[PDB]
Design a protein around this nucleic acid. Structure first.
Ligand SMILES: O=c1ccn([C@@H]2O[C@H](CO[P@](=O)(S)OP(=O)(O)OP(=O)(O)O)[C@@H](O)[C@H]2O)c(=O)[nH]1
Ligand SMILES: [Mg+2]
Lengths: 340, 913
DNA sequence: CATTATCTACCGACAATATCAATACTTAT
DNA sequence: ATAAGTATTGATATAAGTAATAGATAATG
């Protein structure tokens, strides 16, 4: 019987470092019914959940009261929030750890060295049934962390060495609009192509009525996202938030060449492919004209391209005899001194 | 041919003067042709090489490189002449309404008038030369930044145009192109070159592993992401980079501003001096109208004449390339192995085994960082080898001829040559090559001083003069061995701190040892009076410290005391006890701390160095000896903490003067002028701050700190939209940089002033004098006279208290300012209250001061639409309640100047040695 | 009065762009 | 009597270990 903290307690915490959480139990019950987590993790009495950036710890209490997993690790390294978690969930079967989840080392130490949290690695054909990760990365400055966590899916390195672990991610509405843009929308950028290539992600709930104007209309109809007012998050200053369920999928491209090609095409994301393939090295336009056979594709500006066209273009790039060096794609900011 | 050897062969000085006059006139004509015909001569040289290569065969070699240059030029001239043709066909406008909305509307009608003014072949050759010269600059791996390239080419074409105009004006008997037009012109020309340049390349196809050869564009326009902020780049094919690390690069890309063979145009006005046709301003004013405006006012008033005297003495000193050292460096370069600094031939970098993807993210990040480190090291070595190649080619050009360097000043007043590539103020190799053209007999003092210089080079500048002479005497065998065969020997000169100058002086000493009477020998090698903590010397003199002056060799002593060594020892003792205590950080570093490591932190520390800077400075200094991670800064963090702890106690007068300067800079930066502005800018209640720190050099030169908040904007070009800043936009001052920069600029101004005074005096005595900011060079004979002059001029500079004169000058220049006042803390004087009112009548005459000031109060958002309103509002504050007040700027009170006769340095021989 | 976004001593030096949301402005119908 | 570009401008995203680093610290609400 985990005691859930309400608005009274979480009104007392003065510092939040910029993170906005949710406190209404009714919308959380609605969300956990919409997600229907009891379909994949059919035996929760064996599931182990790793909660990053839990903060106030209401989602955690409701999750535990509804599913009773075996191990629930809240990684919150912040003074007032850690104090809150140890004064409210003391002795409770929740596992409260004072560890920064931002640094990569935390996961290596926890799973590898100390073996406090040891989940079970499974194949890469079905979405993992014994490991669920939930995260609240809602700071307006801490958005690059989400990009790192998405990139880890491509390398299969950080927590995705246990297969396809499903993530329940709270994120700023601007990040959710970037990640969930469909080809040709205004907010389509390389973050969206990464999301499309590695993941299929659905909008489980949003914190605003006038935000649905940034997502694709057919996709907004397909997802059927839960809505709530801006009076539901407790620190009511920052922009609205959006919860996104993110499960990795299969992929068979070369992630390094795909990164290069996508990053250098999505710089000039509105010049037609007649003239944007020259930024990919020396002599790119002549070669990519001699190789690309479908001259309808040459008129799609690289914002119009789906991910399959990017995989095709990276296939042509890796077939290029005179392709440039992909590894020296940086600026020597460190010590290009230029003495003479 | 070789002028220097025959000139030295002459027995009598009058014959030398006749020889010098004849060479001077013939070199007048030679220099005159050199400036104008540099591009024509270079273009003729490579077209000739292309024709010569054609007969032999077509292989990818240096002659092929010249062939490529003549091919790019040959296939770029028609494009640019078609552009010019459409420019003249469209410059006859009819109606500016129905025009090509992109290609002519902003593009062609805008730069139209500027393309007609200069003939096309000049523009093509200039674009090729100026794009090759920018190879691997601005942070790009093997290319350039697009902004730097576009602006440099536009500026080179404009300056060549202005040279054409100067030549036409002397023969027959815009003013400053805006940044936007320069950008558009540069972008159009480099675009055409991008669209013509093609170089053959060889590649390996992936599926069949069968080599395939093809022609690809030599230049390419791309982008690169750093830190999220995209950057435009121009990449050059690696096949061309392989050929830029080649011996014949100087023929392709000619240096226009190289040391002139005639006497520099002696400085008579800020607008003229040194170079004949390329105008050179007396100030390297980076991006300021105010700096040039104040310099112009000074020059018109003419009160800086001493700066002209110093620059004219600095410039009229003749050098000559050392033939023997050139031979040794050429042998070492041709050998191909990595020498002391010449890194050595390298084909392509090798990276460690790539880590598997499934590895922890930190491991991949660490590998990526290592890849960045390896790439940086490779590009650094490649750049060093290329720079050395350029320097050796210029040295080869002048193997016999004597050369003069025209000096210029940065905005403080330190003298920097005008020739950027090759000058005596570069790294050690450049200094080794150069020797004084005029040779003077050593004499009794001269021989000993030459020996003391050789001891100085070997790192034994710490010990007294007698010990230096003893050290030189003890190693006579090493001197003869090193002199006889530079290589294939003991190579004693190599161990020295300064590797090349040491061999050159070894050659001089070997010649001296072969003479029965050393004094009759005539020497060329300049002796360096280096200065021990010169900034500290100036702080001690200004403050008037006695203990501080004693530490810094000001007061006469038998043994030289250098502050760096003393603090380094103190830090060493404390670190040793710390390592014994039990920390592991100190044990590794307990011994390595030496004078060199501490000196950088101590100098910067007096000057207001933020802790991050100290951490990096120490990391770089201690990286070679390999006592901690050269890449990492974590190990170095503690060391700087202790350095600061030991240092803080040491300094009192320097800290007082630096603090006063910082407080004065902050108050002056945050001040608002009454007179110029009678209108509120209406940006807000608080106007902008456009007043900058300004003081005058003791010589009379004006110094104006150009630390503004620059406003860049994206101007559109043919290639991209470049983020450049327009120099004419005056903007508010960056208070942070003013406060952090006043102390170093003041001390550097004083240092440069002392140099210019001593240079004028030495040139008056007839001694050639060359000075690298804080070390003065002269023949080993006249070194004694120079030693006397240095001290004397220091006296003539510090006889008057300079900080007080500076504060008085500040109070004069900034009396009628009104610093914005926040909520009150206390009161200082009793004229603040009269400032707000300005109701005292000003009848029958000037003293308008109240009239101009009262209207400014109306701009302080008064409580009115009236007259007695705001005055009543402020009565409460003095009587209590804080307001954002308008108080008169009041500069602080200068620190108490301790009693110490500066005139006691006249008898200290370790002051400069 | 409580809380935060810049830099990291100074000089020779030498720099983010593409896109689009919207504006004042000239055209003109 | 009656509207659509449009040169200028300003905001926003960009990659993604807080630029190769992390403690002050001037400066808003
Ligand atoms: O990083 C620096 C280095 C040097 N300088 C300034 O350049 C001048 C001399 O620079 P250096 O001669 S080499 O270093 P010194 O402090 O003179 O040590 P030394 O006594 O020669 O063994 C001197 O005015 C110094 O303040 C800086 O301002 N910043
Ligand atoms: Mg010195």
């Amino acid at each position: 019987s985990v005691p859930i903290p309400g608005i009274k307690d979480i009104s007392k915490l003065k510092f939040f470092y910029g993170f906005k959480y949710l406190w209404n139990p009714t919308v959380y019950n609605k969300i956990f019914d919409k997600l229907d987590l009891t379909k994949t993790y059919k035996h929760p009495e064996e599931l182990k959940v790793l909660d990053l950036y839990p903060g106030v710890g209401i989602q955690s209490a409701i999750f535990y009261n509804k599913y009773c997993p075996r191990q629930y690790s809240l990684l919150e390294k912040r003074s007032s929030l850690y104090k809150f978690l140890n004064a409210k969930f003391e002795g409770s079967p929740l596992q409260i750890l004072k560890r920064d989840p931002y640094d990569w080392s935390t996961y290596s130490n926890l799973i590898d060295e100390e073996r406090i949290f040891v989940p079970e690695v499974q194949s890469s054909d079905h979405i993992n049934d014994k490991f669920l990760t939930v995260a609240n990365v809602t700071g307006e400055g801490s958005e690059g962390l989400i990009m790192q966590w998405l990139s880890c899916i491509g390398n299969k390195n950080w927590l995705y060495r246990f297969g396809k672990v499903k993530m329940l991610l709270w994120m700023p509405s601007t990040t959710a609009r970037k990640l969930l843009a469909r080809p040709g929308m205004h907010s389509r950028s390389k973050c969206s192509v990464v999301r499309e290539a590695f993941t299929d992600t659905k909008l489980i709930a949003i914190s605003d009525a006038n935000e649905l104007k940034g997502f694709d209309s057919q996709c907004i109809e397909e997802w059927d996202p839960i809505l709530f007012s801006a009076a539901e998050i407790w620190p009511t200053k920052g922009k609205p938030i959006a919860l996104v369920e993110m499960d990795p999928i299969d992929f068979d491209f070369d992630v390094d060449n795909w990164d290069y090609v996508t990053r250098h095409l999505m710089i000039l994301k509105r010049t037609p492919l007649n003239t944007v393939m020259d930024s990919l090295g020396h002599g790119g336009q002549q070669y990519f004209n001699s190789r690309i056979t479908d001259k309808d594709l040459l008129k799609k500006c690289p914002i119009d391209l789906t991910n399959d066209e990017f995989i095709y273009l990276t296939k042509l790039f890796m077939e290029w005899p005179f392709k440039p060096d992909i590894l020296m794609d940086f600026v020597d900011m460190y010590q290009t001194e230029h003495s003479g | 041919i070789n002028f220097f050897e025959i000139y030295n062969s002459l027995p009598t000085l009058e014959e030398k003067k006749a020889f010098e006059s004849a060479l001077n006139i013939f070199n007048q004509d030679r220099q005159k042709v050199l400036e104008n015909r540099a591009t024509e001569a270079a273009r003729e040289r490579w077209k000739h090489d292309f024709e010569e290569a054609k007969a032999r065969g077509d292989i990818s070699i240096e002659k092929n490189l010249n062939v490529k240059l003549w091919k790019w030029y040959n296939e770029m001239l028609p494009l640019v002449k078609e552009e010019i043709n459409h420019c003249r066909s469209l410059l006859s406008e009819k109606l500016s309404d129905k025009k090509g909305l992109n290609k002519v509307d902003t593009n062609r009608l805008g730069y139209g008038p500027y393309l007609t003014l200069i003939d096309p072949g000049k523009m093509c050759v200039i674009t090729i030369l100026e794009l090759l010269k920018l190879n691997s600059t601005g942070g790009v791996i093997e290319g350039m930044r697009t902004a730097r390239a576009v602006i440099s080419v536009g500026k080179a074409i404009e300056m060549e145009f202005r040279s054409e105009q100067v030549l036409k004006s002397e023969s027959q008997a815009k003013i400053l192109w805006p940044q936007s037009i320069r950008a558009r012109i540069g972008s159009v020309l480099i675009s055409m070159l991008i669209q013509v340049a093609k170089v053959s390349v060889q590649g390996v196809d992936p599926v069949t592993k069968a080599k395939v050869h093809g022609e690809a564009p030599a230049f390419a326009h791309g982008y690169q992401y750093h830190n999220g902020s995209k950057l435009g780049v121009l990449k050059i094919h690696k096949t061309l980079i392989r050929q830029l690390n080649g011996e014949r690069l100087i023929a392709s890309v000619q240096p226009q501003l190289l040391p002139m063979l005639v006497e520099p145009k002696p400085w008579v006005n800020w607008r003229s001096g040194g170079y004949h046709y390329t105008q050179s301003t007396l100030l390297r004013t980076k991006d300021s109208p105010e700096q040039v405006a104040y310099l112009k006012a000074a020059s018109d008033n003419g009160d800086i004449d001493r700066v002209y005297d110093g620059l004219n003495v600095l410039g009229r000193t003749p050098w000559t390339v050392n033939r023997k050292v050139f031979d040794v460096v050429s042998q070492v370069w041709n050998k191909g192995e990595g020498f002391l600094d010449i890194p050595g031939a390298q084909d392509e970098m090798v990276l460690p085994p790539a880590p598997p993807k499934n590895s922890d993210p930190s491991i991949l990040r660490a590998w990526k960082l290592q890849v960045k480190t390896i790439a940086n090291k490779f590009s650094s070595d490649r750049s060093n080898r290329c720079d050395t190649n350029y320097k050796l080619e210029i040295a080869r050009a002048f193997l016999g001829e004597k050369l003069y360097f025209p000096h210029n000043l940065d905005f403080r007043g330190r003298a920097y040559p005008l020739s950027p590539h090759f000058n005596h103020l570069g790294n050690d190799m450049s200094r080794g090559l150069l020797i004084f053209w005029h040779g003077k007999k050593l004499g009794p003092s001269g021989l000993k001083w030459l020996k003391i210089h050789l001891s100085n080079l070997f790192g034994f500048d710490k010990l007294p003069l007698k010990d230096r002479v003893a050290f030189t005497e003890s190693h006579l065998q090493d001197i003869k061995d090193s002199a006889e065969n530079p290589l294939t020997g003991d190579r004693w000169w190599t161990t020295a701190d300064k590797p090349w100058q040491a061999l050159a002086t070894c050659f001089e000493l070997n010649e001296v040892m072969k003479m029965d009477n050393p004094e009759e020998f005539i020497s060329h090698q300049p002796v360096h009076q280096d200065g021990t903590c010169n900034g500290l010397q100036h702080y001690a003199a200004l403050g008037g410290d006695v203990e501080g002056a004693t530490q810094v060799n000001l007061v006469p002593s038998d043994k030289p005391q250098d502050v760096y060594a003393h603090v380094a020892r103190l830090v060493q003792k404390r670190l040793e006890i710390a390592a014994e205590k039990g920390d592991e950080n100190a044990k590794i570093l307990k011994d390595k701390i030496t004078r060199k490591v501490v000196k950088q932190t101590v100098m910067t520390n007096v000057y207001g160095v933020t802790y991050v800077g100290a951490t990096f400075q120490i990391a770089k200094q201690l990286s070679p000896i390999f006592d901690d991670r050269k890449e990492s800064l974590d190990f170095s963090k503690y060391l700087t903490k202790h350095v600061f702890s030991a240092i803080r106690e040491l300094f009192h007068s320097a800290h007082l003067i630096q603090d006063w300067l910082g407080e004065s800079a902050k108050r002056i930066s945050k001040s608002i002028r009454l007179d110029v502005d009678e209108k509120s800018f209406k940006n807000g209640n608080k106007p902008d701050f456009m007043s900058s720190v300004i003081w005058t050099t003791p010589l009379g030169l004006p110094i104006v700190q150009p630390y503004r908040e620059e406003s860049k904007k994206q101007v559109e070009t043919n290639l991209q939209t470049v983020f450049i800043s327009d120099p004419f936009a005056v903007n508010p001052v960056n208070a942070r940089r003013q406060k952090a920069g006043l102390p170093p600029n003041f001390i550097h101004s004083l240092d440069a002033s002392h140099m210019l005074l001593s240079a004028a005096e030495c040139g008056k005595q007839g001694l050639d004098f060359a000075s690298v900011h804080d070390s003065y060079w002269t023949h080993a004979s006249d070194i004694d006279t120079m030693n006397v002059v240095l001290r004397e001029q220091f006296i003539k500079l510090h006889e008057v208290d300079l900080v007080l004169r500076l504060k008085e000058e500040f109070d004069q220049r900034y009396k009628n300012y009104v610093k914005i006042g926040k909520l009150k803390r206390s009161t200082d004087l009793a004229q603040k209250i009269i400032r707000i009112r300005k109701d005292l009548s000003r009848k029958l005459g000037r003293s308008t001061t109240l009239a101009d000031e009262i209207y400014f109060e109306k701009k302080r958002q008064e409580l009115l639409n009236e007259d007695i309103t705001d005055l009543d509002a402020l009565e409460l504050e003095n009587g209590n309640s804080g307001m954002s007040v308008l108080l008169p700027l009041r500069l602080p009170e200068i620190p108490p100047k301790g009693d110490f006769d500066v005139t006691v340095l006249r008898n200290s021989q370790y002051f400069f040695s």
